[PDB]
Design a protein around this ligand. Structure first.
Ligand code: NA
Length: 327
């Protein structure tokens, strides 16, 4: 048997055993219909010490890069060194929510962080699809022009700012199939920030599936980020909704990646267009697998380091090619 549940109105496949070699057989069935999946425990496969903030900070902290303020997408005054100093120490940062996006990425990730890249390839779940040598992955086989390498993203949590209208990743469409693994969760301290225990209670105030609540009540799990995921089929409805809300407040808002859809807006989106949200908490070691054309947004509660890898399954190639040609 392949241990699993379905989360969020039975829409997301939770594959509960990262060591099960047959995970792909169950995944094949749900993927066919564009359903997301999450595989938990991938951090036990990884050399997780390699992915700690202290380590990543030291290795690649010499490279200068732009830091984004997540509230307004204005590029910050902070340098990379200041970003990492503030990752878990709030007083070194109302403080702002910073993101260090796609640094490094692609060939630079492979070459500048070779041991992490090797660890990644070794640890990717559902390797039949997500690994470059997987039999259902077309990524390394297609001509160049069909396709849009790994990306690292690090960002503070929104808790210190006390502003859960901030997205650390704004609502946007993904162009290829993607797997996102939460590889580090940093508990921030000082400046009156809510503690680890209070942050758990804030996760508990979210509208969650019971299966998610059980995990949240498991003291060995470490929750990091809040995800909202939408079907690609609903994109035109969501675009209209955001154009409407925009007009009420005084143009393609999905292409702009300019919106975090907060609690009140998600509820109105459901009422006024019937568009449903999948809610997920991503715990340390969770690999969230999304098909091309799916939309999602992320809100870190704690500081999080995510690694994302692109792949190309047959199931979403047509949709992927179209979206890539469009970009
Ligand atoms: Na490395």
């Amino acid at each position: 048997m392949i241990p699993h549940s379905w989360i969020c109105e039975k829409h997301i496949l939770w594959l509960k055993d990262y060591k099960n070699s047959s995970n792909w057989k169950l995944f094949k069935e749900c993927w066919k219909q564009g359903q997301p999946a999450v595989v938990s425990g991938v951090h036990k496969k990884m050399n997780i010490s390699l992915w700690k903030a202290e380590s990543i900070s030291l290795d690649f902290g010499d490279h200068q890069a732009d830091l984004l303020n997540c509230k307004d997408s204005i590029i910050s005054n902070a340098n990379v060194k200041e970003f990492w100093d503030g990752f878990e120490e709030v007083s070194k940062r109302e403080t702002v929510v910073l993101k260090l996006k796609d640094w490094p990425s692609g060939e630079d990730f492979k070459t500048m962080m070779p041991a992490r890249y090797e660890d990644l390839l070794k640890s990717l779940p559902l390797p039949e699809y997500c690994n470059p040598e997987g039999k259902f992955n077309l990524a390394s086989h297609l001509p160049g022009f069909f396709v849009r390498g790994p990306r690292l993203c690090s960002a503070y949590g929104v808790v210190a700012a006390k502003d859960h209208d901030i997205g650390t990743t704004n609502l946007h469409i993904e162009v290829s199939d993607v797997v996102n693994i939460l590889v580090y969760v940093g508990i921030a301290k000082g400046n009156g920030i809510l503690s680890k225990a209070g942050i758990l209670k804030k996760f508990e105030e979210e509208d969650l599936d019971d299966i998610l609540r059980k995990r949240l009540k498991d003291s060995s799990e470490i929750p990091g980020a809040l995800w909202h995921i939408y079907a690609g089929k609903d994109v035109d409805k969501i675009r209209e909704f955001l154009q409407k809300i925009s007009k009420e407040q005084g143009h393609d808002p999905i292409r702009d990646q300019s919106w975090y859809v907060n609690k009140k807006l998600r509820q109105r989106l459901l009422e006024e267009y019937g568009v449903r949200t999948c809610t997920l908490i991503q715990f340390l070691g969770d690999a969230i697998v999304l098909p091309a054309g799916a939309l999602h947004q992320v809100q870190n509660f704690h500081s999080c380091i995510q690694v994302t890898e692109d792949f190309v399954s047959p199931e979403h190639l047509v949709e992927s090619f179209h979206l890539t040609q469009e970009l």
